[PDB]
């Protein structure tokens, strides 16, 4: 477990996790707010 | 004043063939000039 | 001879050599030669240079305390 956790603690794996997290957040924001351009509350 | 009509027929071959040929001949003798 | 020609071994030093890779850097004194060579202060550095080495010999006048 802890060896696999340290493998998951390596830089490419946590970078991949950040990549999926940020991409999914931005994609869901764009999907539920279709095409915004100007901040208007 | 005005150059004759045969001037393009003489100066252009002179500076396109003869003058570069003598220039390369002089430069080739100058490159390989030894003591 | 009296005391020692250089700093205490194992103590941190700051390299004042301008042409060195470790200028204004902190290193550890490994050993100081007592025969009288020009650069007796052997300093080991945590970060390697472009050549990959981490140790160098410096004279007495190019080492100070870590500020």
């Amino acid at each position: 477990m802890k060896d696999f956790t340290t493998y998951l603690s390596t830089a490419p794996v946590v970078g991949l996790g950040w990549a999926i997290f940020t991409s999914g957040l931005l994609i869901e924001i764009n999907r539920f707010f279709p095409d915004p351009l100007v901040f208007s509350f | 004043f005005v150059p004759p009509a045969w001037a393009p027929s003489l100066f252009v071959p002179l500076t396109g063939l003869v003058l570069p040929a003598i220039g390369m001949a002089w430069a080739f003798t100058y490159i390989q000039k030894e003591k | 001879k009296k005391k020692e020609v250089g700093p205490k071994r194992g103590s941190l030093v700051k390299v004042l050599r301008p042409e060195s890779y470790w200028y204004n850097q902190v290193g550890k004194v490994v050993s100081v030669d007592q025969s009288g060579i020009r650069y007796p202060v052997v300093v080991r550095f945590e970060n390697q240079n472009y050549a990959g080495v981490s140790t160098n010999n410096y004279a007495l006048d190019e080492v100070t305390d870590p500020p």
Partner: protein
């Protein structure tokens, strides 16, 4: 009505562009039966286009001579014509997020150096420590200006690696 430009709602080229887009979407839609998934997909695309064109209007956006909306970047001018939400608020938000990133990275750099082999912590990330610093960066400007005040944000020129002249 700044820079010799008209609002998107009052403009004619904006409505012409919207009409052209609706026309080509309807031309693509007419090739499919109403009881098919591409028909619903194109209807959703048309609805999204209409919603976007409605939201771009009545929001202060203005377009000049082509129907494509323009953005005013000078503060003050954007403040007195309700164009601050175009770039002024987003630039402040991006500065906030970028300072969050910088503060989190600085905290991880500093907090992973007082240990044996800091490069090992750099290459294999301390995930609980990284998450703790991630959730502690919400007050990045306060900590940044406080580190500036106490002088720990900047290093003196005596401990800084410097190239020969």
């Amino acid at each position: 009505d700044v820079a010799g430009l008209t609002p998107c709602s009052e403009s004619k080229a904006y409505n012409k562009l919207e009409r052209k887009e609706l026309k080509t979407l309807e031309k693509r839609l007419k090739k499919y039966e109403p009881g098919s998934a591409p028909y619903l997909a194109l209807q959703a695309t048309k609805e999204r286009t209409q919603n976007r064109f409605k939201n771009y209007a009545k929001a202060g956006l203005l377009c000049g001579n082509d129907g494509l909306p323009h953005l005013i970047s000078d503060p003050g001018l954007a403040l007195r014509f309700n164009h601050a939400g175009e770039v002024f608020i987003p630039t402040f938000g991006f500065l906030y997020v970028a300072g969050y990133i910088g503060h989190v990275g600085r905290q991880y750099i500093i907090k992973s150096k007082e240990d044996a082999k800091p490069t090992d912590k750099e290459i294999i990330l301390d995930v609980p420590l990284a998450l703790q610093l991630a959730f502690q960066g919400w007050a990045w400007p306060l900590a940044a200006i406080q580190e500036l005040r106490n002088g720990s944000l900047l290093e003196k020129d005596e401990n800084i690696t410097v190239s020969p002249r």
